[PDB]
Amino acid sequence: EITCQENLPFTCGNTDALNSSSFSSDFIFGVASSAYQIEGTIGRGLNIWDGFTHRYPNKSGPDHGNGDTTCDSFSYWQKDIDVLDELNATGYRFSIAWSRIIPRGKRSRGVNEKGIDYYHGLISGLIKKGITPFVTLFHWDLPQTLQDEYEGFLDPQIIDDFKDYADLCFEEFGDSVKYWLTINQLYSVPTRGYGSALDAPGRCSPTVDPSCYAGNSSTEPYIVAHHQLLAHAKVVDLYRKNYTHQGGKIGPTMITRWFLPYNDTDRHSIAATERMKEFFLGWFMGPLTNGTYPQIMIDTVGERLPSFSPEESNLVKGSYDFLGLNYYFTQYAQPSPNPVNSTNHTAMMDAGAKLTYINASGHYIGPLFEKDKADSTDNIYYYPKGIYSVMDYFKNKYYNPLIYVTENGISTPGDENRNQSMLDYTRIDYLCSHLCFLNKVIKEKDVNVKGYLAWALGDNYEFNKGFTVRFGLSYIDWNNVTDRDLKKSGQWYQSFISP
Amino acid sequence: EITCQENLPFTCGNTDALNSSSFSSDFIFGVASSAYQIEGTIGRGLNIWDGFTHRYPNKSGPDHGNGDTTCDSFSYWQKDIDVLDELNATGYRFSIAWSRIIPRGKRSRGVNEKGIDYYHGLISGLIKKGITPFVTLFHWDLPQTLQDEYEGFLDPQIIDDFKDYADLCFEEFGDSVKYWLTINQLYSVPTRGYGSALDAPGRCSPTVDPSCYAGNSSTEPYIVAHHQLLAHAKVVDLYRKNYTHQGGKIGPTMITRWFLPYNDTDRHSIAATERMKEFFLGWFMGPLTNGTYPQIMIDTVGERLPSFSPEESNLVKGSYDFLGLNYYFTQYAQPSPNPVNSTNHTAMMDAGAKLTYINASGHYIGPLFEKDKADSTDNIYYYPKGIYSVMDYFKNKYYNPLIYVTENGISTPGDENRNQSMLDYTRIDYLCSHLCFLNKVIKEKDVNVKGYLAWALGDNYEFNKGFTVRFGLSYIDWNNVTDRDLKKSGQWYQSFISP
Ligand SMILES: *[C@@H]1O[C@H](CO)[C@@H](O[C@@H]2O[C@H](CO)[C@@H](O[C@@H]3O[C@H](CO)[C@@H](O)[C@H](O[C@H]4O[C@H](CO)[C@@H](O)[C@H](O)[C@@H]4O)[C@@H]3O[C@@H]3OC[C@@H](O)[C@H](O)[C@H]3O)[C@H](O)[C@H]2NC(C)=O)[C@H](O[C@@H]2O[C@@H](C)[C@@H](O)[C@@H](O)[C@@H]2O)[C@H]1NC(C)=O
Ligand SMILES: *[C@@H]1O[C@H](CO)[C@@H](O[C@@H]2O[C@H](CO)[C@@H](O[C@@H]3O[C@H](CO)[C@@H](O)[C@H](O[C@H]4O[C@H](CO)[C@@H](O)[C@H](O)[C@@H]4O)[C@@H]3O[C@@H]3OC[C@@H](O)[C@H](O)[C@H]3O)[C@H](O)[C@H]2NC(C)=O)[C@H](O[C@@H]2O[C@@H](C)[C@@H](O)[C@@H](O)[C@@H]2O)[C@H]1NC(C)=O
Ligand SMILES: *[C@@H]1O[C@H](CO)[C@@H](O[C@@H]2O[C@H](CO)[C@@H](O[C@@H]3O[C@H](CO)[C@@H](O)[C@H](O)[C@@H]3O[C@@H]3OC[C@@H](O)[C@H](O)[C@H]3O)[C@H](O)[C@H]2NC(C)=O)[C@H](O[C@@H]2O[C@@H](C)[C@@H](O)[C@@H](O)[C@@H]2O)[C@H]1NC(C)=O
Ligand SMILES: *[C@@H]1O[C@H](CO)[C@@H](O[C@@H]2O[C@H](CO)[C@@H](O[C@@H]3O[C@H](CO)[C@@H](O)[C@H](O)[C@@H]3O[C@@H]3OC[C@@H](O)[C@H](O)[C@H]3O)[C@H](O)[C@H]2NC(C)=O)[C@H](O[C@@H]2O[C@@H](C)[C@@H](O)[C@@H](O)[C@@H]2O)[C@H]1NC(C)=O
Ligand SMILES: *[C@@H]1O[C@H](CO)[C@@H](O[C@@H]2O[C@H](CO)[C@@H](O)[C@H](O)[C@H]2NC(C)=O)[C@H](O)[C@H]1NC(C)=O
Ligand SMILES: *[C@@H]1O[C@H](CO)[C@@H](O[C@@H]2O[C@H](CO)[C@@H](O)[C@H](O)[C@H]2NC(C)=O)[C@H](O)[C@H]1NC(C)=O
Ligand SMILES: *[C@@H]1O[C@H](CO)[C@@H](O)[C@H](O)[C@H]1NC(C)=O
Ligand SMILES: *[C@@H]1O[C@H](CO)[C@@H](O)[C@H](O)[C@H]1NC(C)=O
Ligand SMILES: *[C@@H]1O[C@H](CO)[C@@H](O)[C@H](O)[C@H]1NC(C)=O
Ligand SMILES: *[C@@H]1O[C@H](CO)[C@@H](O)[C@H](O)[C@H]1NC(C)=O
Ligand SMILES: *[C@@H]1O[C@H](CO)[C@@H](O)[C@H](O)[C@H]1NC(C)=O
Ligand SMILES: *[C@@H]1O[C@H](CO)[C@@H](O)[C@H](O)[C@H]1NC(C)=O
Numbered sequence: 001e002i003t004c005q006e007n008l009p010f011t012c013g014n015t016d017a018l019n020s021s022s023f024s025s026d027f028i029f030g031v032a033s034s035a036y037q038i039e040g041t042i043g044r045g046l047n048i049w050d051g052f053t054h055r056y057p058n059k060s061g062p063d064h065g066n067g068d069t070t071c072d073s074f075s076y077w078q079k080d081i082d083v084l085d086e087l088n089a090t091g092y093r094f095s096i097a098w099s100r101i102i103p104r105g106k107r108s109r110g111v112n113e114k115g116i117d118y119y120h121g122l123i124s125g126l127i128k129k130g131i132t133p134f135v136t137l138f139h140w141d142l143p144q145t146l147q148d149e150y151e152g153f154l155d156p157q158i159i160d161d162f163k164d165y166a167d168l169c170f171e172e173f174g175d176s177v178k179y180w181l182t183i184n185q186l187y188s189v190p191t192r193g194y195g196s197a198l199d200a201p202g203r204c205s206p207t208v209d210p211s212c213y214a215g216n217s218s219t220e221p222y223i224v225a226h227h228q229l230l231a232h233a234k235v236v237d238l239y240r241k242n243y244t245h246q247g248g249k250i251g252p253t254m255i256t257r258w259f260l261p262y263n264d265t266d267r268h269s270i271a272a273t274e275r276m277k278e279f280f281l282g283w284f285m286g287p288l289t290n291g292t293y294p295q296i297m298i299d300t301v302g303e304r305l306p307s308f309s310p311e312e313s314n315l316v317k318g319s320y321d322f323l324g325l326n327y328y329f330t331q332y333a334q335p336s337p338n339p340v341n342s343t344n345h346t347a348m349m350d351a352g353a354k355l356t357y358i359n360a361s362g363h364y365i366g367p368l369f370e371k372d373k374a375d376s377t378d379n380i381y382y383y384p385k386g387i388y389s390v391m392d393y394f395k396n397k398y399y400n401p402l403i404y405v406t407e408n409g410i411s412t413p414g415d416e417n418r419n420q421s422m423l424d425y426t427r428i429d430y431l432c433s434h435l436c437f438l439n440k441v442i443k444e445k446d447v448n449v450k451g452y453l454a455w456a457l458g459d460n461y462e463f464n465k466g467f468t469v470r471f472g473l474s475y476i477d478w479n480n481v482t483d484r485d486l487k488k489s490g491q492w493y494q495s496f497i498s499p
Numbered sequence: 500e501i502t503c504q505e506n507l508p509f510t511c512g513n514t515d516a517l518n519s520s521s522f523s524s525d526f527i528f529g530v531a532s533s534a535y536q537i538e539g540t541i542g543r544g545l546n547i548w549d550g551f552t553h554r555y556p557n558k559s560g561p562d563h564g565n566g567d568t569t570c571d572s573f574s575y576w577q578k579d580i581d582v583l584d585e586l587n588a589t590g591y592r593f594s595i596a597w598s599r600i601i602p603r604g605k606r607s608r609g610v611n612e613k614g615i616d617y618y619h620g621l622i623s624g625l626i627k628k629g630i631t632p633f634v635t636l637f638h639w640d641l642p643q644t645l646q647d648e649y650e651g652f653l654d655p656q657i658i659d660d661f662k663d664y665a666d667l668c669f670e671e672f673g674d675s676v677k678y679w680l681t682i683n684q685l686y687s688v689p690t691r692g693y694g695s696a697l698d699a700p701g702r703c704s705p706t707v708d709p710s711c712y713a714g715n716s717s718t719e720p721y722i723v724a725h726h727q728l729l730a731h732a733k734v735v736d737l738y739r740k741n742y743t744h745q746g747g748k749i750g751p752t753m754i755t756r757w758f759l760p761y762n763d764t765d766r767h768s769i770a771a772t773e774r775m776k777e778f779f780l781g782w783f784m785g786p787l788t789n790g791t792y793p794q795i796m797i798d799t800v801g802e803r804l805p806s807f808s809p810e811e812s813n814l815v816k817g818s819y820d821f822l823g824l825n826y827y828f829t830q831y832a833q834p835s836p837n838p839v840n841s842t843n844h845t846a847m848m849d850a851g852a853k854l855t856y857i858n859a860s861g862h863y864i865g866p867l868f869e870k871d872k873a874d875s876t877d878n879i880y881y882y883p884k885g886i887y888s889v890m891d892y893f894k895n896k897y898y899n900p901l902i903y904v905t906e907n908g909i910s911t912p913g914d915e916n917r918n919q920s921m922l923d924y925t926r927i928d929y930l931c932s933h934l935c936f937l938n939k940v941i942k943e944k945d946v947n948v949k950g951y952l953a954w955a956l957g958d959n960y961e962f963n964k965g966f967t968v969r970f971g972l973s974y975i976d977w978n979n980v981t982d983r984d985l986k987k988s989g990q991w992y993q994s995f996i997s998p
């Protein structure tokens with residue numbers, strides 16, 4: 001019987017009690033990163049994260065930081081491999097920058113052979129240290145040219161351009177890469193990029209944010225979500241029909257959260273909780289497992305929800321070998337109105353739920369996850385048992401999928417100094433508490449989870465936050481980015497992996 | 500009789516001897532700037548200078564600086580108007596960022612109304628202080644989307660996109676703007692952008708620079724030059740047929756240089772000097788005055804020189820109301836081989852000339868213009884009489900055009916400290932020595948020159964050099980860019996204007 005803690009103080013930092021041997025022998029342990037966040041713009045074309053962060057610098061982060069140079073993994077990719085080698089990691093999730101290998105977006109316009117060689121060298125270096133690559137084709141960094149030609153994922157033209165890009169990656173790297181991710185966190189771009197305009201490309205309704213250059217927060221999230229599923233399923237079909245000889249697997253990435261009722265004896269809050277599961281996970285998991293959106297979405301969203309043709313439904317249904325599940329936290333849900341006729345209506349209001357970290361009796365769900373200095377009532381809190389609840393739900397609701405945990409981690413403030421930054425005990429507590437529950441859910445519920453990749457390998461540019469928060473297991477000095485030095489967390493993870 | 504000095508020391512800094520009253524009463528005096536160099540990326544889409552400086556940071560300048568924030572004329576445009584008001588300037592040359600008003604390049608994709616309002620406010624502010632705007636439509640900052648769709652000026656698709664962009668500018672601002680420039684320095688993009696790859700977009704032959712993403716240095720300069728002339732002439736036709744009611748004038752910008760023989764008794768060097776005039780000025784001035792390229796270019800460049808159809812020849816011939824002439828320096832010319840079959844052949848070798856600042860007897864042409872710290876034998880030297888020689892040549896060879904001097908100025912090192920930077924006596928000597936010759940040529944040769952705009956209003960990002968050189972008449976502190984403080988040069992120019 002496995003007992004895991006839910007509240008501070010935790011004791012899972014002790015490698016005598018929890019380590020890699022607690023898990024099956026073939027289980028993969030590593031870390032993750034993304035191209036915009038770590039490489040720098042040297043050697044690549046421009047993408048919508050470059051566009052968004054330069055056009056709307058106060059949305060890039062409070063320091064106006066961006067990915068122009070960041071930790072310079074373009075130059076220091078060998079140092080990333082060295083961190084992984086130090087950890088004795090068996091996996092590394094990284095993304096390919098579309099704009100580094102096809103700067104002009106559409107593959108018929110030509111490829112950047114030097115950009116292809118950059119990834120060849122990385123992949124070869126990983127494999128030579130025994131590290132299995134998990135490669136994300138699209139981690140939000142769409143070539144700027146495609147957004148300007150047709151508004152990227154807002155248009156169905158994106159399916160064929162994404163397909164041709166994916167084909168080039170499979171042709172070039174698939175002899176060595178056996179685990180591919182298509183689109184990072186399907187829920188994110190639609191909602192933050194086209195609903196709230198917190199993320200690139202920064203579209204939304206005029207009264208939601210007057211700085212959006214265009215958009216409609218009520219309709220566009222649904223259009224983008226739909227084209228994301230079609231483009232993902234087209235690439236999966238391509239992979240499975242034309243690259244089956246490479247012996248690899250492919251899947252989407254979901255951002256996952258667990259949801260609990262704000263008031264667990266109030267039927268209205270209980271209903272809002274179940275609505276949240278459908279609108280946040282089922283929006284994509286319904287199409288991925290059944291080829292249709294959830295009935296509550298069909299009913300509520302009405303004419304604003306696109307339909308799949310029979311051919312598209314068949315293409316999208318079952319379009320995964322595995323699921324990359326990212327997990328960070330859990331929210332309480334209570335009812336909220338859905339004012340569809342308001343000019344500031346957003347797709348996110350369709351779920352009819354208001355999300356908090358404090359329930360109706362004043363209980364905070366768990367330890368502090370992220371402090372919000374502008375508004376402290378907006379602090380985010382974590383909940384280690386949520387990873388257990390998510391995994392169990394995916395096995396039970398979504399046909400017992402093979403799962404890899406593709407992201408899991410916590411930030412510490414960028415205002416801390418080096419020493420404080422290195423002594424990141426809050427990060428050991430977060431990582432170990434979630435690893436305990438993950439082991440518990442694998443053993444108790446038999447969820448087919450086969451790996452775990454913590455967010456992040458090193459400090460990087462954080463979407464929306466600049467360099468004001470740090471997520472790395474390895475520290476990077478922004479005045480001289482060459483080195484990546486294991487933090488207390490990285491050292492702890494090293495001993496968890498090789499106890 | 501006017502006597503002007505050619506060698507240090509100069510005495511034209513004395514406003515008793517040379518001032519604005521030395522020139523006709525209607526003569527316009529001011530300063531100039533360009534959008535990429537001063538505004539910052541806030542509020543606009545991305546262009547090829549953003550692309551080039553981020554993809555090839557060591558080509559952006561030795562400090563890797565770029566135009567991301569620069570002096571923040573987006574925020575501080577009122578402070579630029581204040582500098583002009585302090586100078587009692589009567590003209591200001593600025594450029595419109597295509598990417599600020601049409602971020603998606605093609606006008607049918609929509610316009611950025613807030614970007615239009617930015618220029619409305621500037622123009623209105625200038626006119627209210629009695630300053631005549633001279634507005635450059637294209638100062639090299641092509642929306643990145645157009646370079647990625649069809650390689651910008653390499654393709655004839657650029658003509659109609661440039662035309663639609665120009666139309667929008669005339670419609671929006673032409674009721675107030677009466678002097679328009681089409682393309683800044685026609686010789687520059689073809690040669691530096693597509694021949695040497697020193698400038699965006701950074702194309703060239705593989706053995707010229709292995710870092711070019713594509714190109715051909717022998718052919719591409721000619722293609723781009725040709726499309727530049729066609730796009731320029733299309734816009735001029737549009738202006739003169741559809742916006743004649745606005746009562747304004749339009750013209751191209753040429754970079755001008757004078758050329759002297761390396762050895763003035765050697766017929767080979769004399770021939771190389773005359774070749775240089777044709778290949779550097781006649782490349783564009785031949786088409787602009789006659790609808791054909793110079794015969795020496797037709798003969799030497801052969802199949803690599805495009806031909807104008809009769810319709811295109813007619814469109815391009817006479818396509819100017821005035822000429823914007825930029826002038827900085829003069830070179831000696833001697834013969835050099837033209838190895839057309841070499842893989843590193845460039846369009847610039849077609850002239851069969853090698854350019855220096857020192858003649859065959861060891862005479863340096865004039866005072867120091869720019870020091871080159873990597874290689875001192877590469878220092879550039881200036882020649883005040885060259886402005887006289889250029890103006891006289893344009894009147895005599897090119898049908899007595901109306902001319903405005905659209906750029907003239909000198910850099911000082913970015914390594915100097917504030918105090919040294921402010922005491923920019925070398926800049927007063929450069930500006931006054933050229934103004935003396937300009938007055939002399941207007942009086943002696945009756946050249947129809949009606950204004951002079953010194954390069955630059957303030958310190959900015961310098962193409963190819965970052966923030967390592969300063970060209971401003973007003974100082975900007977890079978640790979806090981709000982203020983623009985008149986240097987010794989700006990104060991001298993203030994007294995030259997209002998003695
Ligand atoms: C897994 O995919 C199955 C489809 O392959 C889902 O079953 C389908 O569910 C739909 C309803 O969503 C059933 O379609 C209904 O068919 C009747 C009967 O002929 C309809 O009137 C109803 O159409 C009306 O309601 C719609 C909203 O649902 C409106 O959009 C429409 O304008 C009408 O108001 C709907 O008919 C559809 O109408 C729109 C068409 O373009 C569409 O093709 C048409 O089918 C459908 O019969 C059913 N298919 C079968 C083979 O059973 C399945 O849905 C789950 O199971 C069914 C039994 C219902 O209980 C659903 O509520 C529940 O979601 C889904 N499973 C999951 C878990 O999502
Ligand atoms: C101002 O524009 C005038 C054109 O409106 C120029 O005059 C034209 O000059 C061209 C030569 O460049 C003369 O064309 C020649 O016509 C003969 C006679 O029929 C040709 O064989 C010669 O073609 C051959 O030489 C070419 C290189 O010049 C090659 O490309 C071609 O393959 C042949 O090798 C050329 O004929 C032209 O060939 C290419 C065709 O597609 C083209 O249309 C055809 O014309 C032309 O007759 C002449 N036009 C008239 C009305 O005079 C004028 O050129 C200047 O003046 C003329 C007299 C010559 O001295 C030129 O050397 C000199 O540049 C130009 N002025 C300026 C100052 O540039
Ligand atoms: C968890 O949700 C439950 C279920 O909603 C909350 O209990 C309900 O709380 C209501 C108070 O907000 C109770 O209703 C009231 O009852 C008093 C006593 O008779 C009456 O005077 C009030 O007018 C009110 O009655 C309602 O008026 C509106 C009508 O539309 C409606 O029909 C009436 O319900 C209600 O009885 C109670 N439900 C039951 C199942 O207990 C619970 O609220 C917390 O506990 C309740 C007992 C009460 O002490 C609340 O003060 C306290 O907030 C809520 N828990 C939390 C922690 O918010
Ligand atoms: C400015 O250009 C002029 C014209 O080219 C230079 O003068 C020429 O310089 C040549 C030396 O480079 C002279 O030719 C030589 O004459 C000596 C004396 O007879 C002879 O022994 C040499 O072999 C050579 O002769 C040539 O050999 C190559 C053959 O293909 C050719 O037919 C011969 O010309 C040449 O006489 C002279 N031209 C005349 C018009 O004076 C001038 O050079 C400078 O002045 C000349 C006088 C000489 O003192 C050079 O040392 C000195 O560089 C050059 N000016 C500069 C400053 O470079
Ligand atoms: C978002 O787009 C939707 C659909 O185009 C707009 O909602 C429609 O608004 C038109 C104009 O009132 C109405 O006649 C229809 O009833 C609406 N259709 C549906 C599907 O709701 C909505 O106004 C647009 N929002 C923004 C802010 O532009
Ligand atoms: C530049 O483009 C030109 C023309 O396409 C190339 O020169 C041609 O080269 C082909 C292959 O040798 C020759 O057969 C022709 O004689 C050339 N044409 C002319 C007009 O010169 C040149 O090789 C290309 N340069 C680069 C470096 O790719
Ligand atoms: C690993 O953790 C397990 C508890 O599940 C423990 O039994 C084992 O001894 C630990 N391994 C080491 C080497 O500490
Ligand atoms: C696969 O590749 C072949 C040949 O390149 C092509 O004919 C076929 O349509 C492709 N695709 C898919 C996704 O099946
Ligand atoms: C618009 O929405 C904001 C936040 O969603 C809300 O605070 C405000 O009350 C809404 N206004 C209207 C007119 O509904
Ligand atoms: C690496 O991990 C393998 C597998 O668990 C282990 O046998 C080996 O000793 C570890 N190496 C280090 C240096 O920890
Ligand atoms: C301006 O310069 C001219 C010389 O051309 C001189 O005669 C005149 O007095 C000067 N003006 C003033 C006010 O110094
Ligand atoms: C001018 O505008 C009119 C109407 O918009 C158009 O029909 C005509 O073709 C345009 N152009 C030029 C360059 O003449």
Ligand SMILES: *[C@@H]1O[C@H](CO)[C@@H](O)[C@H](O)[C@H]1NC(C)=O
Nearest residue numbers: 706707838841842843844845
């Ligand atoms: C190539 O050109 C460079 C500079 O233009 C020159 O130094 C070199 O000698 C040339 N090589 C060949 C093979 O011509």
Ligand SMILES: *[C@@H]1O[C@H](CO)[C@@H](O)[C@H](O)[C@H]1NC(C)=O
Nearest residue numbers: 519586587588993996997998
């Ligand atoms: C501005 O220039 C005009 C025209 O020469 C002049 O009359 C006026 O006094 C000048 N103002 C200042 C403050 O120098």
Ligand SMILES: *[C@H]1O[C@H](CO)[C@@H](O)[C@H](O)[C@H]1NC(C)=O
Nearest residue numbers: 055056057058059210211542
């Ligand atoms: C930040 O910038 C946008 C324009 O990019 C502007 O709408 C907004 O006022 C600014 N936000 C704040 C909070 O200052």
Ligand SMILES: *[C@H]1O[C@H](CO)[C@@H](O)[C@H](O)[C@H]1NC(C)=O
Nearest residue numbers: 477479480481482483484485
């Ligand atoms: C920066 O860090 C690297 C690795 O720690 C070091 O070797 C290099 O000398 C440092 N550069 C400077 C300028 O300090």
Ligand SMILES: *[C@H]1O[C@H](CO)[C@@H](O)[C@H](O)[C@H]1NC(C)=O
Nearest residue numbers: 043554555556557558709710
């Ligand atoms: C600078 O960068 C380019 C790649 O952008 C590379 O080809 C070249 O080696 C570098 N230049 C120097 C002088 O280091």
Ligand SMILES: *[C@H]1O[C@H](CO)[C@@H](O)[C@H](O)[C@H]1NC(C)=O
Nearest residue numbers: 976978979980981982983984
């Ligand atoms: C920077 O300069 C402006 C103008 O000189 C000044 O008013 C502002 O206070 C300064 N900001 C800082 C942080 O020094």
Ligand SMILES: [Zn+2]
Nearest residue numbers: 054068553567
């Ligand atoms: Zn930047």
